[PDB]
Amino acid sequence: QKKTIAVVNATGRQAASLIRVAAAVGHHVRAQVHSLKGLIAEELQAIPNVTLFQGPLLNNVPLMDTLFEGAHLAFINTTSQAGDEIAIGKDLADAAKRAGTIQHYIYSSMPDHSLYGPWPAVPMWAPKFTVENYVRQLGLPSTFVYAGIYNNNFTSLPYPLFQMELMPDGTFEWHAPFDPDIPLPWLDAEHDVGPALLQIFKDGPQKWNGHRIALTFETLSPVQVCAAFSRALNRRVTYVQVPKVEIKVNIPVGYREQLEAIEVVFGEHKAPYFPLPEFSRPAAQRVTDEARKLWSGWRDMEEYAREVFPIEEEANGLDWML
Ligand SMILES: [Cl-]
Ligand SMILES: [Cl-]
Ligand SMILES: [Cl-]
């Protein structure tokens, strides 16, 4: 029988991608979800091999102990939502070590930029690095994956930072603080995270214990992203660098503070998205090497812009794609 994988925030893009491919090949999944309501939660309730455990993570160790019971593998990706990401991250790691049966613990981590230059720590990223350091100290056989920017963030709706805005004449414009020519790491979370994580588990601790892996299959500067959308949609697409991220809709304070940090780190300092020496300087050799080695079936930005974006846009009530 395939191994049992414990997962949290099951409805999130990363966890859901892994659950789908894992259950399909025979793995049993023990997954935590904050609510059983919702299209993804219901989708997951429909999969036999998946067992859902509804409840919060924040200070809910008993659910954690239950989650890991009989689990052989784990893929943990936390969020800043509950307000105690480090606490939850340490609790999950402690619970996994306590289970005694976890052979491989994959934690989705991020950089703490303040460690690499005269830059601010990015609010929703730095805490994850603190959790990674704790996981490393536990001695739990582990691997740390660093997700690139989700291709899925793009929308013509007035959401911050990644608005591919539709102009009156049918052209699109994307305004953000990123330097137009510095390449950024991108990731088609839905399509590529699951396959990549499965391969990391197949390779095992022998191959990745204590390693960091950048989960990005393509790096593109903002102008290269626009060129991909342009070729995909046969419309002009233009990138415009702006110092501040305009907020046109109500957003959580947490995201608000995240955006302010992005303006400083990328707008002002033009710092790397993955500033760790192994990803920046030694680059990885390209930063996409390991991800591509793990999964060669990845989807590029141009294909996403041509095949997926129009479908998600229609589903969001837009009709420019007729
Ligand atoms: Cl969830
Ligand atoms: Cl034009
Ligand atoms: Cl609003």
UniProtKB/Swiss-Prot annotation:
Residues involved in NAD(+) binding: R13, Q14, N77, T78, T79, K128, Y150, N151, N152, N153
Name the GO terms of the biological process aspect: negative regulation of DNA-templated transcription; nitrogen catabolite repression of transcription; nitrogen catabolite repression of transcription from RNA polymerase II promoter; regulation of nitrogen utilization
State the Gene Ontology terms under molecular function.
NAD binding; NAD+ binding; NADP+ binding; oxidoreductase activity
| Inducers of expression | Up-regulated in nitrogen-sufficient conditions and down-regulated in nitrogen-limiting conditions.
Consequence of gene disruption: Displays partial derepression of activities subject to nitrogen metabolic repression.
A single GO cellular-component term on record: cytoplasm
InterPro entries the UniProt entry points to: NAD(P)-bd_dom_sf (IPR036291), NmrA-like (IPR008030), NmrA-like_oxidored (IPR051164)
Q: What is the effect of changing E263Q?
A: No changes in the Kd for NAD; NADP and areA
What does changing N9G do?
13-fold increase in the Kd for NAD; 2-fold increase in the Kd for NADP and 2-fold increase in the Kd for areA
Keywords attached to this Swiss-Prot or TrEMBL record, sorted alphabetically, are: Cytoplasm, NAD, NADP, Nucleus, Oxidoreductase, Repressor, Transcription, Transcription regulation
The answer on whether this UniProt entry bears the keyword Manganese reads: no
A Pfam family it matches: NmrA
Cellular location of this protein?
Nucleus; Cytoplasm
Effect ascribed to mutating E190Q: No changes in the Kd for NAD and NADP and almost complete loss of affinity for areA
Mutating Q199E leads to what result?
No changes in the Kd for NAD and NADP and 2-fold increase in the Kd for areA
Residues bound to NADP(+) are N9, A10, T11, G12, R13, Q14, H34, N77, K128, Y150, N151, N152, N153
Report the family membership: Belongs to the NmrA-type oxidoreductase family.
UniProt subunit comment: Monomer. Interacts with areA.
Q: What does this protein do?
A: May be a redox sensor protein. Has much higher affinity for NAD(P) than for NAD(P)H. Has similar affinity for NAD and NADP. Negative transcriptional regulator involved in the post-transcriptional modulation of the GATA-type transcription factor areA, forming part of a system controlling nitrogen metabolite repression. Interferes with the interaction between areA and target DNA. Overexpression leads to areA inhibition.
Database matches in PANTHER family:
NITROGEN METABOLITE REPRESSION PROTEIN NMRA, NITROGEN METABOLITE REPRESSION PROTEIN NMRA FAMILY MEMBER
Q: What is this protein called?
A: Nitrogen metabolite repression protein nmrA
Q: Which gene name belongs to this protein? A: nmrA
